[PDB]
Every structure is written in structure tokens, then in C-alpha cells.
Amino acid sequence: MENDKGQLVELYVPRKCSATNRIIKADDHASVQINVAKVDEEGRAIPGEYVTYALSGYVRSRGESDDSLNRLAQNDGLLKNVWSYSR
Amino acid sequence: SLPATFDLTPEDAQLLLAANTHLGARNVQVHQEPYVFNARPDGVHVINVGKTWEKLVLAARIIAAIPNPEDVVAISSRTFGQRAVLKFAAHTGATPIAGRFTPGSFTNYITRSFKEPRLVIVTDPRSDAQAIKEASYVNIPVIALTDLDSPSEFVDVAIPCNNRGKHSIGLIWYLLAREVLRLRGALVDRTQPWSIMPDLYFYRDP
Amino acid sequence: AKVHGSLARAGKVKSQTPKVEKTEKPKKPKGRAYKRLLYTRRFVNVTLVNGKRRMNPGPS
Amino acid sequence: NTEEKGWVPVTKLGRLVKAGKITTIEEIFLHSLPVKEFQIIDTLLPGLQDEVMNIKPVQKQTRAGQRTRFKAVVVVGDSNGHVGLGIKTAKEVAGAIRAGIIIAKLSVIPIRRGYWGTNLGQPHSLATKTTGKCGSVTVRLIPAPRGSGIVASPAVKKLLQLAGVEDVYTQSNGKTRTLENTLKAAFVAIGNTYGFLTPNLWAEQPLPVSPLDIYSDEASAQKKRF
Amino acid sequence: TRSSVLADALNAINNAEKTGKRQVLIRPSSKVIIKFLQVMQKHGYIGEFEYIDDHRSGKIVVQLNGRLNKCGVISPRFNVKIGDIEKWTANLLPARQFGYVILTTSAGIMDHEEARRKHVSGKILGFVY
Amino acid sequence: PKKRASNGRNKKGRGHVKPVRCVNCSKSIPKDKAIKRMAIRNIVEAAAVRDLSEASVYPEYALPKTYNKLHYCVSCAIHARIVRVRSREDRKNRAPP
Amino acid sequence: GKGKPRGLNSARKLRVHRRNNRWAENNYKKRLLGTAFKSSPFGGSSHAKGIVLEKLGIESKQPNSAIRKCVRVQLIKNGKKVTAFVPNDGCLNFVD
RNA sequence: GCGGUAAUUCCAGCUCCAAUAGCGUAUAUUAAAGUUGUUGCAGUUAAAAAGCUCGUAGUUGAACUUUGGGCCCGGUUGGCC
RNA sequence: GACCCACUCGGCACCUUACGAGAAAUCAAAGUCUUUGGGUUCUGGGGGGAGUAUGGUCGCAAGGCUGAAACUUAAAGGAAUUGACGGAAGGUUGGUGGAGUGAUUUGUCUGAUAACGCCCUUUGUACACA
């Protein structure tokens, strides 16, 4: 997204989707950003730090965003079992 | 990531199973959601409670991440659910809405009931469809308390629970509220059963 | 349609109207001079009120 | 005299704009935060000028006699790389125009402008072949080389000049005489530039943290008695 | 009657891409399709596919990563000649700076940029971007 | 405008049925399209039932009913019989009441 | 596959169909049938010179109510009876 | 579409605009006409799917018949050398 | 033999979405088409003139099949929308927000709630000086 001599042009680098990698865009209001806080031993939330997930508008419209979110959070490592890869 | 503290205890399981949350829908499991366990006779499909607890912990963990507790908004049209949301607002932060949702809420100002929530929670997506659809036009994630028969449009971290009433939805709400008090609060680990009872939420007689 | 018609009025209006003459004036300077003149009246100052301008203003 | 300015920051963006926490519109574009108030994008970037486009009357037969109204298509823009198309209908002409401008200011969208083929100083054309539709009118925008100009219909051409798209080819289908549809199609097309994966955009960034959460305690919907 | 199998494969890939999947089943595969998916895989429009074996046809389970906008067949495979490839790019590809009109040469099934440097051409096949 | 999906009442995957004669006007019309009604009225009405039951020989006995299938011609169905004309949304509704 | 044959070796059906289906538009029909030369008053030429017959008073259509003052003309070349309008204000008294 | 007695469209005159030693008018034709469409049209209701089936020519027609691994030789790109 | 439960192939159609498509009405296919190529037969190119004339060919006949031009006109239609009408059925207006590409509609409504602060409704319409 650059010119010839370094200098990065192309204003605003879009957000990729977490689920399908489709570009969520400026006008699109159906898209969502989920923020999950970082737990540890000694309990409690610990504000400041977030594991983020950008769900697209289409994914939410179609109505299988839930499944995608179950998948995404699992590989990060905050769900023992829950969602089977197999079916 | 996944500590040994935040696990499904037997007492909580015995509460859940007492409440009949594990009894799923009569008619059909919607194909969008796989949270099924043994198609038992007499037309009932049992839900994985280990998942239910976990999804609840996810939702709670999401809620705890939001900086101001006032901006979250619980929604309900079922009287039981209305009571529950009022209790959720009584204990934790998060201003509720009971009864008629009063459309045009999350959309543009001018109305009195103008709220711009970071996050929204719903009892039933079929009965509060207008709320779900309202949320989509201003970057509001939804966390519904779905059943097997219910939809899952515009929903995130949908929790599979029985949403008929009596003692069911209130139990789920109790679990959520308790969880989010345990996070960002002064409560101890699994040892403490907490002062407030599950009997407080449930239903509203007569 | 019909071929018959009142042809007696053929050139009614061209006749009865008053036949006055052209007024003599200063000579319009032609070619490049004309272009110069156009450029001057347009891109200097004088225009109508509002954003839009009338190049041929009526006296009023 | 007895006057006062009165901005009145309703919604969560107003306070941010007034306090001066967010300087640019890039953040807004990233997180898709819906601009309700027109005064947000005005003082956020004063360089955002304007434009009109077209005015046509729209009539309405009734019991008594006949109602009449004036529709104004007001396209607004700025020569860096942001544009808005605002259609409005009202009984007065000035009222139609002002409201149209407001609507155009509300719904602004940026344009991913790139090169024809070679890479050089300053982008001039569109990044990709984009197309937008509205009714019969499908408008297509094809990238052109340097100093080629905006080869299009006068309305679409104006829309593109507002954006600061120097060089670009266009086509169209359907009954293009209606500007109601054509300019909407053009808007859809220039909008879909950012919704298209080039290879340089596959390099996955970390997902920026939402700015709403950074300054939630500082500047947001406060209680406040008087 | 399945007239072109490559066409069917590509149809399947596109529909699944539009519906927002990460994976597809396609039938009944070929050499041509495998070569095609290798060409695609080299530049990285798709992930690791897998040809299963059954004594008749062969199904492919393709894993796609959502870099693929649209790829499509060009039937009937016309005959292309040195500089016609450029004209083809102008017709169907979105920009000059990326995308691949894939085509079959006597050298082998190959993208257009490699054919320019190898200095060969032949029957055209689909495109990718 | 194609004003119905069904077009005629209940005929798909056939192409022809045997027509029936309308009871009221004697108009010919397909058997599917006849807007039919099961009339199930008594031999004696609620007005005539009491004295007639009192003065009859044998206790209770029977007092049967007349059964017949009334057919119609659409025109007759709207003019005389209950059916009405309905809205675009109420065209979609199927229940008898 | 969109109606028409996209076969590689089926040029015949494409060209033939097009030649059959060209017979619709005005210019193709006017050219190939030879209609300008066969039929019509002029012989496919721009200006045709003619004599006259008589002056007319043509009753014009609605809404444009007037009398038009045309001339019936017999031409030189074919010698067909034609009607022809006379332009400008007045100017029917020039011709006889 | 203007003209039924106030014509911003006619007749003149004032002023203005276009092109400018050159403009207007015809008929033919090219583009726009993705209104011929291979690239590139349409065919439920706007013109248009032939009553339906068979069937010769014509058009099109599953997959499958050697990839990989190396060993060197070795030209072309750009920068420290 | 029948029925119930779960799965299964082949259709008859249906109900809900709109992912998409469509100018719309609407469509699980009229979708997978300017990001315009699965194969392939048939038909159309403004409306009248005309499914007429002329020619052939088919048939006992009626007609069918194939099927023009000159001339004439600035429309013709399609969909939906507001009224207006019916010798059809029953008993006021913007602000902001949605529903729509708009016309506009919703609000300003069945007797609650996509809204928030002679008259009417639904349908038919080739009328729209009605």
C-alpha cells in the first residue's frame, strides 16, 4: 500500500474479519468487535488488557456467528472442549 | 486462559439439574447450534451443561471487560425475565429494560429512552426480535440466552438454556450475576456460596 | 387532410410590422481583439448577485 | 442581543469531538462508529467543503387539489479522499437543500485510491475495477493512467472531482438519465473500493483496540445534576 | 452431463467462498484441477487442499483461507497468441498490479506472468483474483 | 400482475380435472376451483324443533340432518355466499374462520 | 450457458443467427433491400429538383392549429406527385 | 411544445452567446447503439420459451496412460567485493 | 396387515428468511451475470399497418405453416404509488427514526405497538381537467 520511495500512503488500513478474513468496511454497521478480559490465578478481571475478536456483518446476518466465536476463542485457549472440529 | 478455579462444581451442577435447564426444546433443535446430548424418548433433547457453564463464563468474562458497568443493558419481555433483569441491575450495574422494549431505543437520539450500550443481553431472541434487530445498526454485540428451537441472528456467545420460565432463566441470570461479581469484586474462590440466594430471582407470583 | 385553405393571409405578419432601420455604432474589434474583449468583461469584476451570474443582464 | 452558540453533545461521539480526544476521521472509519450528529465530521476536519448537484420537483395528488414538494440531491465532498451523497425532499427549496447537505455530512465514506500500473509519487486512480448498482443503473469505474481525466457523465464526473480522483474511466448501463439512481450507484461503487482484497492487504494486523473502551470513564454519558 | 469438471470445481469454490466457508468438497477432480489448484496455491489464494482416493473419480477437499475474491473458468478455452494475454487481462482482471489469468501451454498449466518470461502461450483456462 | 401464486384453487402437477356444474347458476367450473361447502342443516330448524319433538310418536326417536356438498362459481360465491374480498396480507391467510 | 452456443468450433451457428437476426433494425433493412432506390419519391438522393402543380392550404394537426401553405410538386426525374412545405414567414407568393 | 390581444419560442430592433474566413441546411454513414450483444442484450408479467416427445446432420461430451528426488554444468536480475 | 420414532432416496407442492437476484410484483430458484463464459435447441427487437397482401407448401373443405412492404405515428407498454371513481365489501401537518432504488409510506394504528415525542378501511381500475 506504499508509494515508490517508502512513505506509506493509502489512508486507513481496513479491519480484517476474525472468522472469514473479509474486509469489514467504513459504512458497515452490522459488524461487531468482541473484547474478552484476561483472567488468571487469584481470580478477577485485570482491566487494560483485552483479547479482541472482529466479527463481520455478513457472519452475523446469516446467523452462524456463535459457532465462529466458539471456534476462535478455543484456539486462543479459553474453552476446554465445547466445540468439536468434527461433525 | 483456562484456570482450575473456574470449573463446573458438583453443587452448581445439582442446582442446574434441579432447575431443569438440561431439559431442552420439545419440537426441534435448530441446525445453527450444536449443543445436543442424547435424543432421549418422549420428544426431549438434553443439553451439555458443561458447555452451558463455560459459555456463561465466556459471557461473564466479556461483560467484565467493559469499563463502565452502567452502559450494559439487559432486555426482557417475559415477566420472570423482567424480574431477573431487575435483580441483575439491583446487584451489579447495567440499567435494564422490562416489558415493552420501546423501539427506536438504540437508534438516533430525540427519544427519552436513548441508550448507546457497548453490550446487550437478551432473554429470548424470538420474543425480543425487535431488540436484536435494533442492536445491529450501531455496533452492539448481543449475548442471548437461547434454547434449541430459538434463532441465532445477530447473536454472539449464545448460551443454550431452557427459557420457558418458573425457575429457569432466573437461575441462568443468578449464575451470570454471581460470576461477574466474582470477577471485578471482593469474593473468594469455590469455597464461598455467596449471601444472596437463587430463590430471590426466579419468578413473580401470583 | 384538406388541400383548400385561406392563402390570402400568406405574408400577413411580415408586411404590417414596422420596417425601421439598423442603428450605426462603434466598430466591434474582430478576431483576437474580440476574444480579448470577451475575456475582459467576464474575468474582472462585474457579475449578478448570488453565486450564479448573468452575462447578458436586462436593465432593471 | 441575547444569543448563545450551543453545541449540545448528545451521544458518545459528541463529547469526544468537543474535548478533542480523536483528531482524525481514520479512527471512526476503522471502527465503523455511526455518526449521528452532523457536527462531528465538521469540526473534526474543517477542510471538508461541499457541493450541490440537482433539484427536481416531486408531486402528490390529493383530495383538496395537489401537494407539491422539492427534492434536492446534494453531493458533498473534499479533494483529499472522502465524499458524501445526500438525497432529501421537503416542501421548501432552501429547507430541502440544507437538510440534504446535513444528510450528506452524516454519511461520508472514504475512497481507496491507487495507481494504474506503475508505482509513483501520489495515487491518482482507483485501486480496482469497482461497480455499483441502483435500479437499472449499474455504474462501473475502471482505473486510468496519469493525466487521462475523468471520462464520465457530467454528474458522475462532478462526484468524482469532489473526491479528488484525478484520472479514471467509467461506464454505465440502464436508464442513466435519472440522477436519483446514477449518483447512488456511483456512491456504492466508490464505497466498494475498500471492500476488496488486494494482495498487500493480506498482511494481517493485530485488530486495534476500540477507542470507546480507552476513554469510557473520562468522556462518556455522565450523570450530572446541574 | 458434467460438460467441464474444472468449471464445476470452480463454481463450487466460488459459492463456498461467497457463503463464508473455509472448506469445500469438489467432485470429480482431474489432473487439470490439481495443477490449477497448485497454481493458485503457489501465489497463495488458497490453503492446503487434499485429494482423497476412490476407485473411479477422486474427490478433493479444499481448504481456502479467504484471500480469494473470485476465480472462474473461461470456456471455451480459446487460443491465445503472445500479446493477446495482455488484452485478456484488461477484459477480466481487476487491476494490472495483481491477479492471474491461468492458461495451459505445452510447457504446462501456468499463470500469465510466468508465460511472459518463459515466452510461451497456448489454450486459455480460468482466472484468479 | 400475477395476483396469486396458486392462480386457481389447488391444481398443481396435473393440468386437467373434470369440471362440475355450479348449484346456483349452472356455470361450469373445475372441481378444484368450485369453492365448495359442506352444508349440514337439519330437516327441522331450531324454531320448528320443540313442538315437533313434543307431538312425535316414540321418545326422542332420531331427528336426523340433511347432508350435501354445495358447489359454487366464484361469482355466486361472492355475491350470495360468505367469502368477501380481502387485503393483500389476508389473501395469504388460509384458516376457515 | 446463456442461450447462444459458446462452442469453439461452432462459428457457423453464430454468424448465421446474427445474419438472420440483423433483419430488424432500420439502417440494415433500408440498405440491403434497396428500398431507397426502388421505392420512395427521391432516388435515395439529398436534393431532388422539381416543377410544381399547385399551392395548398394544409390543415395542421392538434394541438398546433394553423394553415401551413405547402406546394404540390411534380418532379423532373421520376415525375411523381409530391407535397412540399415552403419555409419562412410569407414566401408562398414568390413561387407560382 | 410556443401563437385566443401583457409571446423570456413568431416579426423586427437593442444587448448577449457560439464557432470565427468560415458557419448553416439536406441525404448516406461511423460512434454513442451492451437499440445485434463472440467479448456484450433480452425472452414469469414489458416484444419474445416454439403443445409435447422422438430423432438424422450440426454443436458439446467423466476421469485415467511418468510425477517427484537428486547430482552437476550454467546464463539472467540487483548490493556489500 | 397397520401405526409411531429416526434415517433414507425419487418427485407433488408448500411455510419462513433474504445470503443473492429483480425496475418492481416477487423468486429457492427467475440465485451462482460488468467480479459480466457448464453444455445446448428455439424466439424477440418502438407501436400501428398485419398474423393482413403476395407467394409457395399442407388439407376433401374451413383453415394451417412460412410470412412482407409502402404508408403511418412519438409513443406503446410493464410494474408499483397518491387520489378519484364503482349500479364493489365491512364499519390536518411537518421534527427525528425506521420500511423502500424511488413515487412515498409508517407515525397520523387491530380494539396494543417501528415508532418516539357524509367520513373511514380494504380491495378493482385502461380515469388522473378525475
Swiss-Prot record, chain A:
Subcellular location: Cytoplasm
Residues carrying N-acetylmethionine: 1
Membrane-spanning parts: none
GO BP terms, alphabetized: endonucleolytic cleavage in ITS1 to separate SSU-rRNA from 5.8S rRNA and LSU-rRNA from tricistronic rRNA transcript (SSU-rRNA, 5.8S rRNA, LSU-rRNA); endonucleolytic cleavage to generate mature 3'-end of SSU-rRNA from (SSU-rRNA, 5.8S rRNA, LSU-rRNA); translation
PROSITE patterns with a match to the protein in the record: RIBOSOMAL_S21E
Post-translational modification summary for this protein: N-terminally acetylated by acetyltransferase NatB.
This protein's record includes keyword Acetylation: yes
Recorded phenotype for the gene knockout or disruption: Reduction in growth rate, a decrease in free 40S subunits, an increase in the amount of free 60S subunits and a decrease in polysome size.
Keyword terms of this UniProt record: Acetylation, Cytoplasm, Ribonucleoprotein, Ribosomal protein, rRNA processing
Cellular component terms per the entry's GO annotation: cytosol; cytosolic small ribosomal subunit
Assembly notes: Component of the small ribosomal subunit (SSU). Mature yeast ribosomes consist of a small (40S) and a large (60S) subunit. The 40S small subunit contains 1 molecule of ribosomal RNA (18S rRNA) and 33 different proteins (encoded by 57 genes). The large 60S subunit contains 3 rRNA molecules (25S, 5.8S and 5S rRNA) and 46 different proteins (encoded by 81 genes).
Family indicated by similarity: Belongs to the eukaryotic ribosomal protein eS21 family.
Additional facts recorded: Present with 27400 molecules/cell in log phase SD medium.
This protein's name: Small ribosomal subunit protein eS21A
Species annotation: Saccharomyces cerevisiae (strain ATCC 204508 / S288c) (Baker's yeast)
Organism classification: Eukaryota, Fungi, Dikarya, Ascomycota, Saccharomycotina
UniProtKB/Swiss-Prot annotation, chain C:
One Pfam family linked to the record: Ribosomal_S30
GO terms assigned for molecular function: structural constituent of ribosome
Chain positions with Phosphoserine modification: 15
A biological process term (GO) from this entry: cytoplasmic translation
Compartmental location: Cytoplasm
Subcellular location, principal: cytoplasm
Region (Disordered): 1-34
Keywords: Cytoplasm, Phosphoprotein, Ribonucleoprotein, Ribosomal protein
Entry annotated with the keyword Ribonucleoprotein: yes
InterPro entries: Ribosomal_eS30 (IPR006846)
Phosphothreonine: residues carrying this PTM: 47
A single GO cellular-component term on record: cytosol
Subunit structure comment from the entry: Component of the small ribosomal subunit (SSU). Mature yeast ribosomes consist of a small (40S) and a large (60S) subunit. The 40S small subunit contains 1 molecule of ribosomal RNA (18S rRNA) and 33 different proteins (encoded by 57 genes). The large 60S subunit contains 3 rRNA molecules (25S, 5.8S and 5S rRNA) and 46 different proteins (encoded by 81 genes).
Functional note: Component of the ribosome, a large ribonucleoprotein complex responsible for the synthesis of proteins in the cell. The small ribosomal subunit (SSU) binds messenger RNAs (mRNAs) and translates the encoded message by selecting cognate aminoacyl-transfer RNA (tRNA) molecules. The large subunit (LSU) contains the ribosomal catalytic site termed the peptidyl transferase center (PTC), which catalyzes the formation of peptide bonds, thereby polymerizing the amino acids delivered by tRNAs into a polypeptide chain.
Miscellaneous note of the record: Present with 37600 molecules/cell in log phase SD medium.
Family statement: Belongs to the eukaryotic ribosomal protein eS30 family.
Name this protein carries in UniProt: Small ribosomal subunit protein eS30A
Curated annotation (Swiss-Prot), chain E:
GO molecular function ontology, one term from the record: structural constituent of ribosome
Listed GO CC annotations: cytosol; cytosolic small ribosomal subunit
Chief localization: cytoplasm
Subcellular location(s) per record: Cytoplasm
Record NCBIfam families: PRK04034.1 (NF003115)
The encoding gene: RPS22A
Pfam families: Ribosomal_S8
Superkingdom as given in the UniProt entry: Eukaryota
Additional comment: Present with 40400 molecules/cell in log phase SD medium.
PANTHER family: 40S RIBOSOMAL PROTEIN S15A (PTHR11758)
Matches recorded under SUPFAM superfamilies: Ribosomal protein S8
Function: Component of the ribosome, a large ribonucleoprotein complex responsible for the synthesis of proteins in the cell. The small ribosomal subunit (SSU) binds messenger RNAs (mRNAs) and translates the encoded message by selecting cognate aminoacyl-transfer RNA (tRNA) molecules. The large subunit (LSU) contains the ribosomal catalytic site termed the peptidyl transferase center (PTC), which catalyzes the formation of peptide bonds, thereby polymerizing the amino acids delivered by tRNAs into a polypeptide chain.
Annotated coiled-coil segments of the chain: none
Alphabetical UniProt keywords: Cytoplasm, Ribonucleoprotein, Ribosomal protein
Protein name (record): Small ribosomal subunit protein uS8A
Subunit structure: Component of the small ribosomal subunit (SSU). Mature yeast ribosomes consist of a small (40S) and a large (60S) subunit. The 40S small subunit contains 1 molecule of ribosomal RNA (18S rRNA) and 33 different proteins (encoded by 57 genes). The large 60S subunit contains 3 rRNA molecules (25S, 5.8S and 5S rRNA) and 46 different proteins (encoded by 81 genes).
A biological process term (GO) from this entry: cytoplasmic translation
Swiss-Prot record, chain F:
Misc: Present with 16300 molecules/cell in log phase SD medium. There are 2 genes for eS26 in yeast.
Compartment(s) where it occurs, according to its Swiss-Prot or TrEMBL record: Cytoplasm
A biological-process GO annotation: ribosomal subunit export from nucleus
The protein's role, per its UniProt record: Component of the ribosome, a large ribonucleoprotein complex responsible for the synthesis of proteins in the cell. The small ribosomal subunit (SSU) binds messenger RNAs (mRNAs) and translates the encoded message by selecting cognate aminoacyl-transfer RNA (tRNA) molecules. The large subunit (LSU) contains the ribosomal catalytic site termed the peptidyl transferase center (PTC), which catalyzes the formation of peptide bonds, thereby polymerizing the amino acids delivered by tRNAs into a polypeptide chain.
GO molecular function list: mRNA binding; structural constituent of ribosome
Keyword DNA-binding: no
Keywords annotated in UniProt: Cytoplasm, Ribonucleoprotein, Ribosomal protein
Disordered: annotated span: 1-19
Family: Belongs to the eukaryotic ribosomal protein eS26 family.
Protein name: Small ribosomal subunit protein eS26A
Cellular compartments per GO CC: 90S preribosome; cytosol; cytosolic small ribosomal subunit
Main location: cytoplasm
Domain of life: Eukaryota
